[PDB]
Design an enzyme around this catalytic site. Structure first.
Site, PDB file in Angstrom:
ATOM      1  N   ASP A 167     -10.336  21.124 -40.087  1.00  0.00           N
ATOM      2  CA  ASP A 167      -9.654  20.058 -40.840  1.00  0.00           C
ATOM      3  C   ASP A 167      -8.251  20.376 -40.977  1.00  0.00           C
ATOM      4  OD1 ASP A 167      -9.037  18.350 -42.715  1.00  0.00           O
ATOM      5  OD2 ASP A 167     -10.082  19.136 -44.628  1.00  0.00           O
ATOM      6  N   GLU A 207     -16.811  18.557 -46.291  1.00  0.00           N
ATOM      7  CA  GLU A 207     -15.835  17.652 -45.216  1.00  0.00           C
ATOM      8  C   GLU A 207     -16.487  18.265 -43.886  1.00  0.00           C
ATOM      9  OE1 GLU A 207     -11.931  18.372 -46.611  1.00  0.00           O
ATOM     10  OE2 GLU A 207     -12.149  16.869 -47.992  1.00  0.00           O
ATOM     11  N   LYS A 235      -6.659  17.299 -55.423  1.00  0.00           N
ATOM     12  CA  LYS A 235      -7.863  17.735 -54.787  1.00  0.00           C
ATOM     13  C   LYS A 235      -7.846  19.391 -54.925  1.00  0.00           C
ATOM     14  CE  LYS A 235     -10.213  17.040 -50.419  1.00  0.00           C
ATOM     15  NZ  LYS A 235     -10.500  15.955 -49.317  1.00  0.00           N
ATOM     16  N   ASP A 291     -13.818  10.618 -47.250  1.00  0.00           N
ATOM     17  CA  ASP A 291     -12.905  11.751 -47.149  1.00  0.00           C
ATOM     18  C   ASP A 291     -11.863  11.527 -47.897  1.00  0.00           C
ATOM     19  OD1 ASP A 291     -11.393  13.838 -46.174  1.00  0.00           O
ATOM     20  OD2 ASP A 291     -10.814  12.362 -44.312  1.00  0.00           O
TER      21      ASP A 291
END
Lengths: 85, 357
Positions: free
Chosen positions: B170, B147, B70, B8
């Site tokens: 998330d 994810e 990211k 992750d």
């Protein structure tokens, strides 16, 4: 006091490392605490002969030409204060 | 072990879990924290910190510290770091080399393969960027698990064989993703995705720090914007107040000496926070999560009752503000628990790894 000045330098390294480690708590504790407090302390520690000043000039112009132009160097004042005696 | 791992690589929470014979073991980084903060601080050396070392230089190498690349994976997000411009693959590859040698240390040999994740709002350009970073750092993403998918893996949410509905919230410290997942046959679809790719629990922390200095100047009138180390300190104390008030109703924060006060007295910090005020403070940051979930809902057209599992991933979903708006919007549906939300997607990606191994 020479060690404390070096100690003041040590405090500056301490504030450097406090800010390195993110130690905000020590950043100001050194900037507004230790370093300035030792600085006032060292200002108080200053006794007075390592550079010519506005009195050595008077000393030279008194040795030459004989005319006394000084600051009543702590012995002349007492004597001048009792002259009519 | 599984000869691979799962990662992750959070937007602020870069975490890697391995499989101790299938047991999901989130490896303590060489930094100690199993979560590497997903920050890459190109220290003014050519050297590059990562993690809380880098995080510390988010204020100092503010001009050379990278966060949430990211989000900028799929481009040549190429940052002029002293020498040349370093694209997002290489900024990620740096954290990957850190995690690589952390795991090699944890092992006694460099068992390096991985299953590194993407938000469901990502695109295959970001995933090609990760392919390149894998060519760079020397770890294998034998496959990417998005994810939310690795979330449903991590909690072992293998509900109905015909199809299962997994909701996934998330909130990394720097990322938000609502995702709804139709899963079956061991094959996964994130049916729908929304979120707020700018929001994260460190955006939550940033609102916190806003308030902190707000009432700092409310009483006395000094700004820790004026002090960079003070900004670092506010940020760190704010995220650790995040993980605090992921359990605590209220957390009092205090700091000795900081800057001179109005009367030239080295001022400090001291006061309570109540998490009520926190969820008030993230309230528009909580609106930054709701209508995302409304969008994923409409994308799936699914009743929250029909959802077969909910999931909390990204460490800022330890927060009960997260779980509050969950059980509000989800009709009270409890997300599944058993792994730290930062650990979650890394854990389940590791489970996919072992499924490969």
């Amino acid at each position: 006091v020479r060690d404390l000045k070096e100690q003041l330098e040590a405090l500056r390294g301490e504030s450097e490392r406090a800010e390195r480690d993110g130690d905000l708590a020590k950043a100001a504790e050194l900037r507004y605490g230790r370093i300035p407090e030792v600085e006032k302390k060292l200002d108080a520690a200053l006794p007075q002969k390592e550079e010519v000043g506005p009195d050595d000039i008077a000393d030279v112009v008194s040795a030459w030409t004989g005319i006394p132009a000084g600051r009543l160097l702590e012995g002349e004042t007492a004597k001048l204060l009792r002259m009519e005696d | 072990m599984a000869r691979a791992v799962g990662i992750d690589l959070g937007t602020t929470n870069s975490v890697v879990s391995v499989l101790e014979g299938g047991d999901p073991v989130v490896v303590a980084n060489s930094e100690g924290s199993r979560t590497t903060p997903s920050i890459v601080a190109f220290a003014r050396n050519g050297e590059v910190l990562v993690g809380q070392p880098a995080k510390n230089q988010a204020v100092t190498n503010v001009d050379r510290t990278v966060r949430s690349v990211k989000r900028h994976m799929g481009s040549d997000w190429s940052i002029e770091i002293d020498g040349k411009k370093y694209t997002a693959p290489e900024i990620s590859a740096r954290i990957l080399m850190k995690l690589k040698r952390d795991a090699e240390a944890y092992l006694g040999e460099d068992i390096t393969d991985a299953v590194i994740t993407t938000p469901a709002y990502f695109n295959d350009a970001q995933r090609q960027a990760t392919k390149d970073a894998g060519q760079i750092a020397g770890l294998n993403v034998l496959r990417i698990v998005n994810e939310p998918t690795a979330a449903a893996l991590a909690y072992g949410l293998d509900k109905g064989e015909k199809e299962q509905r997994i909701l996934v919230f998330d909130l990394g410290g720097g990322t938000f993703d609502v995702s709804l997942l139709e899963i079956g046959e061991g094959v996964v679809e994130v049916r729908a995705t929304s979120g707020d790719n700018h929001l994260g629990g460190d955006d939550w922390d940033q609102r916190v720090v806003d308030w902190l200095v707000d009432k700092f100047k409310g009483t006395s009138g000094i700004d820790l914007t004026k002090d960079k180390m003070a900004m670092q300190r506010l940020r760190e104390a704010a995220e650790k107040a995040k993980i605090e008030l992921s359990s605590s109703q209220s957390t009092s924060i205090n700091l000795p000496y900081i800057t001179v006060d109005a009367d030239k007295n080295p001022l400090f910090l001291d006061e309570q926070l109540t998490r009520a005020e926190f969820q008030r403070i993230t309230q528009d940051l909580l609106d930054r999560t709701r209508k995302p979930f409304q969008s994923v809902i409409a994308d799936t057209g699914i009743s929250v009752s029909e959802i077969d599992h909910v999931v909390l991933v990204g460490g800022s979903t330890r927060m009960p503000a997260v779980t509050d708006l969950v059980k509000e919007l989800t009709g009270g549906k409890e997300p599944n628990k058993g792994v730290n939300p930062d650990e979650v997607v890394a854990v389940g990606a590791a489970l996919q790894a072992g499924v490969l191994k």
